[PDB]
Amino acid sequence: PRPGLFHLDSSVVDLSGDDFSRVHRVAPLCPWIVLFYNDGCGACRRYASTFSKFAGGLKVEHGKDALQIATAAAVNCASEVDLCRKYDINFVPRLFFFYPRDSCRSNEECGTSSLEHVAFENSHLEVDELESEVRRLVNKHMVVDDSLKERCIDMHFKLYTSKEELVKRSVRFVETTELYATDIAGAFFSAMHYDVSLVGTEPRERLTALEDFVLLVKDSLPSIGADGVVSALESITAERPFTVASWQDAVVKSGIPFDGSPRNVRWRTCRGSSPQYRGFPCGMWLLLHALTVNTPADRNVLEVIQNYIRYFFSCKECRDHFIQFNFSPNEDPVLQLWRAHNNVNARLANVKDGADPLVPKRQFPTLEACTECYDGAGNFIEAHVTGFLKQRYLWDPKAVGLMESNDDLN
Ligand SMILES: Cc1cc2nc3c(=O)[nH]c(=O)nc-3n(C[C@H](O)[C@H](O)[C@H](O)COP(=O)(O)OP(=O)(O)OC[C@H]3O[C@@H](n4cnc5c(N)ncnc54)[C@H](O)[C@@H]3O)c2cc1C
């Protein structure tokens, strides 16, 4: 177990291998600048500083510049011997550029593509020459829609922040069961900042699906910052069309009361044993239940929800299964969504790969949590389950806004 030259540097991804889907599921879609080095190499030790300064510049939160879709990574040839032999690394340092043969386009479904690479002619580049050469290589080798840009920026911020945690803790787990308003807001924020940016507002069906959803969030959940979003949605004209850049600006400016920052969203209820687990998906369920519970009028909540998931949700498999749900008009939406979710819980009960080992899926609510709706001896009582859900998901606008503790800088 060698630390290498980057162990404290959250801007650089340490690679043990060639398969970028093990880094992250979106990684194969994005360009990589890779430093092969040896941790005992003085020249490499000296250059790692330059490489690290450069990587630090791949942290812009909303980039205009296509350089920003790149991410820096490194392979320590002292640890990964087979990998370096595979690339014929003899002398170090060496810079390689990696990129997908074909680029994913906005509303196409990105598939697996062939991993391509380009050895740099000169591996001694200064920071500025590094940016120029990486930008050039990205432009030459890739077609980047705004959606793909968002895809990759989001992906490397997940890694920066996950590694920074490991670094911070380099100086036991218990699930947080209580519902926190801020998770619902994080979900709303991530829905607007990420999911909508990927697909845009076209065609008219999709734009309608989004308008209904945002309109619903605003009227269901006051003081969650949906006002600004509504305004942004209204500002779109054939004259001033949707752009990811202006959309994300308005979204950030809406003042949604999520914890964390636009590129690092803090989950509480939805925090997992590792940051790759739970988070946004867990957040979305919460937002959806809260809407069923807090919805005004005869409002079509289940219909609105399903239209949104259909045109918006960034989980392919999730989107496909949720559309298969036939929601009856009769039964209470709170109960229908509740059954749907537990249905998904059941399917997912035993999955190993991809799952948080320390957060089982159960049938919800559990005995402990609710003994009043969970009674009837050996079965489930759907009488109190409503009361429990309408209690637990009830939205109190003064819950979110209120002093938070600064020591949560930790
Ligand atoms: C619409 C939708 C469809 C999805 N489809 C898939 C899919 O097809 N395949 C897949 O692998 N993943 C799917 N997911 C993601 C997956 O369901 C989980 O969100 C994810 O695996 C993480 O689960 P979790 O352990 O954090 O709890 P989650 O399943 O995300 O639940 C989040 C929180 O909601 C509360 N909750 C749990 N059950 C209920 C309930 N029955 N009623 C009300 N509240 C409840 C709990 O507090 C829980 O912590 C989907 C998510 C959504 C929102």
Helices of type H across 117-203: 127-141, 146-168, 181-190, 196-199
Which technique?
X-ray
**Overall resolution, Å:** 2.3
DSSP 104: P
154 and 26 in contact (C-beta within 8 Å)?
yes
> In the block, which residue shows the tokens 């050039």?
136
List the binding residues for FAD: 278, 285, 321, 338, 341-342, 345, 347, 361, 364
Name the E strands within 172-277: 260-261, 264-265
Ligand 1 mean position, distance from CA 361 (Å): 8
In angstroms, what CA-CA distances link 151 with 154, 195, 221? 5, 10, 28
Cα(304)–Cα(320) distance, integer angstroms: 16
Residue 29 sits at φ, ψ, to 5 deg, of -80, -5
How far apart are the C-alpha atoms of 306 and 203, rounded to whole Å?
Answer: 17
Contacts 24+ apart (CB under 8 A), 367-375: 369/177
Query: Which residue ranges have their beta carbon within 6 Å of ligand 1?
Result: 269-270, 278, 281-282, 284-286, 289, 309, 315, 317-318, 321-322, 338, 341-342, 344-345, 348, 359, 361, 364
Q: CA–CA separation, 27 vs 156, rounded Å?
A: 8
How far is Cα 369 from Cα 354, in angstroms, rounded to an integer? 26
Q: Which fold has domain 1-171?
A: Glutaredoxin (3.40.30)
Q: What are the residue ranges of CATH 3.40.30.10 in the chain?
A: 1-171
| Ligand 1 atom nearest to 286, measured from its CA | 34
